[PDB]
Amino acid sequence: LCPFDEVFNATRFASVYAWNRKRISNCVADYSVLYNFAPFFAFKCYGVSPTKLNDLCFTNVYADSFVIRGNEVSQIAPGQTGNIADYNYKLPDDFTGCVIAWNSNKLDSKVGGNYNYLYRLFRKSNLKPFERDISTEIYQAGNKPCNGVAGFNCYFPLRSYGFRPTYGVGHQPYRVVVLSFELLHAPATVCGP
């Protein structure tokens, strides 16, 4: 029995551009803890159903955790467009599994701003599903080469969120956990009691 507390009850989450990923296998996967958790600003599920995932067995459970703004919570969904979906975290259209998001203004907001959470604003191409791009290279937005000098149209591709306690609900920090369930032809291991 490996629960979901070590990821949900985390002291510090990860930035969306460097989202954390934990594998889970060879355990009994309960989901009453998910109901017992926070007011749960968002709890939506694609493919699986809230009362169905407790029964069927899965070969693997992939848990992706990060922190985003309340405006972009709707961007964590299959077939969606936006900065987060294009350059930070892309969910496939065939995604099976589901998404939990909850407000964390208490933890991830500090007076004067909490600049520990970053997102990627510039990228030439769209991310593939479940891709990671943690490189920090100066973004060449024009013909003139940068050569590591961030001058004029040459920018650092990562920008920090504000995350101040007084911000509106749209810009307040929200913690997001995405569960992907894999039930491949290999014998299943992770199922409920």
Epitope: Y87, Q140, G142, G162, G168
Partner: antibody, heavy 121, light 110 residues
Framework: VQLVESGGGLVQPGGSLRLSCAAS????????MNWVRQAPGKGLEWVSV???????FYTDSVKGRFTISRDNSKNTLYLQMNSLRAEDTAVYYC????????????????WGQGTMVTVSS | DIQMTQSPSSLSASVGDRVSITCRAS??????LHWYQQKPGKAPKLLIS???TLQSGVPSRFSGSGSGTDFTLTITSLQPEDFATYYC???????????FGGGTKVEIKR
């Protein structure tokens, strides 16, 4: 950095048009590229945006009849307009979003000269 | 659905007088406010970014202040070439809600 607008003119109601924005010193397919319209004597109004990765967004009043595209061959921006109406009579600017040396997000640092589009019969 | 109101709509002042323009939003938008300057017949020019950050090549007389729902644009030494129109634009609303203000016109006083 120069953004040269072209393709403005007068058309009958319900017609089509194509506006072009030739860019210099900046790659169109690498920057947030916006089309912003300004009615004669009125204020500015955002119309459309295209992301570096290809995603496109439109305002409510132009959804379904406007299209925004890039062209990496000629390094140009294209705005295709259909089902035009008298509310479309305005000067159009192709602008770069989230630029400038301080790199301010959401701000149009570089603007074109704008071309006038008239919709009347 | 955030609407920005600029005050005053028109403001007449001579050369050398400190001039202030206020932009107020219907709701708090943090510091996602920008100040643009436009002379007639020309394209707008970005003056102030993030409600406080001076852009490159802009005289230091232009200054931005405020946050939340109230933002102020201030000119200290108002040169004769600075009698243009000024717009406040917000970049807070996510989907397509990037909107400009009504524009404050600054013109000479005699």
């Amino acid at each position: 950095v120069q953004l040269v607008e072209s393709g403005g003119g007068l058309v009958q109601p319900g017609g089509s048009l194509r506006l072009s924005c030739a860019a210099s010193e900046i790659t169109v397919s690498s920057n947030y590229m916006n089309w912003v319209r300004q009615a004669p004597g009125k204020g500015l109004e955002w119309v459309s945006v295209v992301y570096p990765g290809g995603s496109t967004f439109y305002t409510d009043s132009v959804k379904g009849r406007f299209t925004i595209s890039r062209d990496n061959s000629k390094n140009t921006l294209y705005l295709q307009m259909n089902s035009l109406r008298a509310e479309d009579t305005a000067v159009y600017y192709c602008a770069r979003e989230s630029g400038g040396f301080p790199l301010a997000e959401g701000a149009f640092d570089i603007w074109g000269q704008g071309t006038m589009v008239t919709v009347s019969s | 659905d955030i609407q920005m109101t600029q005050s005053p709509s028109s403001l007449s002042a001579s050369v050398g007088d400190r001039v202030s323009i206020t932009c107020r939003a219907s709701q708090s938008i943090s510091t996602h406010l920008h100040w643009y300057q436009q002379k007639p017949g020309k394209a707008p020019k970005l003056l102030i970014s993030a409600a406080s950050t001076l852009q490159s090549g802009v005289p230091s007389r232009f200054s931005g202040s405020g946050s939340g729902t109230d933002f102020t644009l201030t000119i200290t030494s108002l040169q004769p070439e600075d009698f243009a129109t000024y717009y406040c634009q917000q970049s807070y609303s996510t989907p397509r809600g990037l909107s400009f203000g009504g524009g404050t016109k600054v013109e000479i006083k005699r």
